[PDB]
Structures are given as C-alpha cells and as structure tokens.
Design a protein around this nucleic acid. Sequence first.
DNA 1: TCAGGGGAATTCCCCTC
DNA 2: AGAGGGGAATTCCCCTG
Lengths: 312, 312
Amino acid sequence: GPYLQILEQPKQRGFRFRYVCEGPSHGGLPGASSEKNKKSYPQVKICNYVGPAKVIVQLVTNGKNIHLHAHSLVGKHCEDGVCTVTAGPKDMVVGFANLGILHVTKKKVFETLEARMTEACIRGYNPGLLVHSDLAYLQAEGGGDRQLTDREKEIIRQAAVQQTKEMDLSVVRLMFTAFLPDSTGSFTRRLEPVVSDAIYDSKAPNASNLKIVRMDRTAGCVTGGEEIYLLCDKVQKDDIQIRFYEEEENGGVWEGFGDFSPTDVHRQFAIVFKTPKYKDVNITKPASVFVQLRRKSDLETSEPKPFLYYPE
Amino acid sequence: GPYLQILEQPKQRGFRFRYVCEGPSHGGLPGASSEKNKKSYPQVKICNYVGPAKVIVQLVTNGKNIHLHAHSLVGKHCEDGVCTVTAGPKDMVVGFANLGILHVTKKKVFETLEARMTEACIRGYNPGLLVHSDLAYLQAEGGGDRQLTDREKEIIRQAAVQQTKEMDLSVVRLMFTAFLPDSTGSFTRRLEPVVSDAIYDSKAPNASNLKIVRMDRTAGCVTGGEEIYLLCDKVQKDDIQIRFYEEEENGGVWEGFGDFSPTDVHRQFAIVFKTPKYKDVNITKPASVFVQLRRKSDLETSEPKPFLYYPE
DNA sequence: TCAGGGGAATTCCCCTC
DNA sequence: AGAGGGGAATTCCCCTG
C-alpha cells in the first residue's frame, strides 16, 4: 500500500536552534547534502499513490518513546509548530526549506508542550501517537473544527507533566505525516508517519561542529613530543581528542593521539598538546598524515587538516 | 568638626558580582591591600570624634550623578542593601567583612531601584544626594514612622525610570555615612559621607582580569614580525592590545604593539600575532623585553611575562 | 534583507584549598 | 564533607554582510 519515504534526511549536526528572543529568519533546516551553493533540504516522497495529497511535519522526541517536543517549527507553512504543505499533483516528492527550530526555555517546557498538545488534538494530527493513546480516536473525525471536552484536557495535562522531566531540549526529530484525500476531497486518510534522523542543536557543547580553526605548527618531527597550539571551536576538555591518522596498505589505518591534559584545553577554544610518535621513526621521506578533533563520547570526526612527519 | 576617613578601600578589580541564583557563599569583598593569608577588608575610621556612633554603607553608582544602585550589599549587618554597624564605645574603627555584591538582573533593576529609593527616603539616608534633590528635606524626622506622601512617590518613580536606563551594572561604589548621637542619644546627626573607589565586576568583559595564560614562542628575534600564538583570558577584540615594553636607563620607554587583526582574536581567548621590531636591530647580545596585555579603553596592566630579542 | 555569527547576560555546577 | 571561586551551559542581544 501507500507509504511515505524520506528521500533526504535533515543534517543531524550543524544547525543552531534559536529562541523567540534571538529573532526570526536565521536560516532553514538544511538537508543532509546541503553543501554551500548546493543548498539541499529535507525531502520526502509518497509512494504507491499518485495524486494530490498533504504532508505535515512536527517535532518529536529523540528517545525510544515518541512524544511531542516543546520546541516548535517556525517558518512559512508552519503554524503553532506544525508545518503543513500540499504535495505536488504529479511530483510525489516534497521538500521543506526555510524551517527554523524554535528552542523553548526549560521553565516554558510544560506550558508550550501542553499548548501544542491541545493544538495537535484539535487538529487531529496523530493525537494518540504523540500525546496519549486514550485520544487515538480523533483521526479527523468530522470536518474541520473539533472542540475538545473537559476530560480530554485532563489527559493533555497529565501527558504534559510526565513528559517535562524526560525531554532533552538539545535534540529533536522530525515526524512527517502524509494525508490522502477522502470522498469530500479533504486530506484525511492518514498513512504511517515516519521519524527522521536526530537533529542536534549547535549550541549543545556535546553535539556542536568540531572545527580546527588554526594551528601554529603544521609540520612536526617523526620523533614527536613537540608542543603545538591548536585553536578550535567550542570543545569539552573532558570529551575532546586530537587524532592523527593516515590511511595505509589501502584499507589499513594508522592512529595516534596527542598527549594533552584537560587542563591544557584553554577555555574550550584552544588546546596545547604534543605530537605522538609515528610508525617508521626510522623514516627517510616526509610522510603525510591528517589530523582531526574527535569527541570521545560521540566519536564524531572533525574536518581533517594536513600534517607532515619529517626525519631527524 | 568630625569626619569619616576611609582607612582601606575595597579592591577595585578581582571581585565577581553574584546574582541571587549563584548563591550566598562565593566570597567577600576584599580590601585594596588584601592578599592570601593577609585577608583584609574595607575599613573606615571616625576621626576628630571619640565615642559611640553609627556607620552605614550603601551602594552608589559610578558617574557624574551619585545615586542609589540596583545592586545590593549582602551579608550579616546588611539588610535591604544598607549595611549598618555601631562603631562601638571608644573603638572608632569600622571593618566590613563578608560583603558580597548582589548583581541584579536588567529586567528587575527598576523594581529594585524604586524599592530602595523609597527606603532611602523613609530612613532619611541622604535622599537629596541619592534619589533627587527635590527630596532633600527628608532628614531625622522619623526612622520608619515617617510615611511618604504621593508627590514624593511620584518623584521617586520618576527618578527610578530615569536612572534605570542610566545605571552601569558592571561598576559600583561604596558610600559610608556616619551618624553621631544627639541629646536623646539616637544616632541622627549626619556627617559628610565619603565615596569609595570604583568596584568593577570581574565578569564584565570590559573590566575583567588581563592575564597572559600561555605563549607559543617565548623568545623571538629582533628582526621583526614572527608569528606567535598567545592564549589569554577573556578579552575584547576591538578593545585589546599586546604591548611589548622594556624599562631602560635612557628614558626607558619603548612601546610596541603586536601586529594582529581583530579577526586573529580567536573567540576572545587567543590572539595570533606578530612581534614588532625592537630598537638596535644591530645588537650583539640577547636583549630581554617584557610583554603585557593592555586594554585599549582602560590601559590596564596585565601580569608581565618574560621575552627576549636576539640579533640575526 | 535573510542568513548567520559572535558575544553578553544569566543560571548552574564543579574543583581546590 | 563546604566556602571560595572559577568554568561552563543556557538565554538573550544585536552586529555583519
């Protein structure tokens, strides 16, 4: 039967979540292949069905238990945190550009979560899957307006109080839900929604972009233990590593880490370290290796920089 | 007649202002001559008068107009921002230890300021000097009993709205006011108040501590621009200078600033720059020069570190 | 501009005596 | 095991191109 397939996922890292105070129009959530000039965006595709339909996007949690996220989606076609756009009549592919991720305050988690749960219940956008199964009977029953009862508000507040202590404000996910038309033509037939890759805030120190801005000495001796200063982006002294590596044997790898202490990490932006020992200390020609910044917890690679080992 | 003399002023820089959230036990305001083990505190002395008296201390602003400051003084003898202590019979020496400077939020400045202005009018603590000259008639009538009128509250609120946007939250001053007894014995005869030195918050980037944490090359050549990386504390790229200096017996004033661009200042904590040319390029012996970080606005001295120029 | 980025203000938490 | 600081994370502000 018909389903929804994510053609291009959003970029997991590099995007910066912004609060209401930071202002508007600061960038759109880019695609996984959104290099400079080759600006791409998250794309989905409704398969096994040809014709006009609608696609909604909502923010969900990163944990095993999928639930609504207090963060919102801001931009055009987005109202109250949900972005709704009509798919092409023939191009069953849908792209999402100019999507910002509104970061909520920790104190304003409960308030925003409850408000957007109320919205998701009045609009019937997967009420039982994200809030609570007790309200999984509101699959757009009726046309348009769907006033809520008193017990339904009770369930909303119960789900909100329980999901406040379990929400990571630094990571979100995209849930794409497709809606196929019915008899009257209104988009109401809901197929299985699909969750996107995890989206990590750039303001989170454990998931930012690892970049080697500058190095004082770009070429050391094959012996090693030479002091080098590396100016970098924001890194955590207890969760940072400087890795020299070279591809060898056409398949094999050579690693080697700089010997530095967390005290040598100067205020998250600079590291004074010492070069490790190379393989062939009895080398004859200067060998070329790459250097990167690797997070010990995430094992995330920084963009490598050239480095050279010279004999003595 | 009798006056009040500040024996030891507080240390102008080095102390960090703290908000209500940061807690209570983060340090006491040290004196200008304080050091480790030699723990000193701001002290004053009532001169030309022997006997019991009273000394109050209040926070005032730095600027042309001396006025109450939204920041408060926290501690034992301090209540609602004013620290009152009896000089004791025949002691006449007054010390002020365990004094913290409560940093208020920008949003809650006005609320606090007006709240402390009314108090200064109800208690008669220099109302015309600190609040507004129109209220320079509020002395000695009552120490709490004298409720204020409506026009007085209008003047207080006007002074508060005008001085909220005119207050520097990063610098304060201490005002000591002495009170001699009268016939009935109540301390009400006000002596001339004395203002202390300016106290600059260490967490303010324009008044922080200038420290040379690390240098890539600690000895360069007299030839000229050699690139060296300097790891430092928080400095402002548009208001920072790297000064090479040497005191000599022939006038002994040689200045010379490192050739760096504000772009070379890596995230306020590192500067990649080039050493300037010293005098006597045709030297024969290695000459020693010292290095500092000098703030462009304040011309404040950093802790010097050794450096040397060798010929070619 | 809209797309970013740096940095300041504010809150929270850890390291060394 | 706690005060004194200091660093780091979380929100907020606004400058640049």
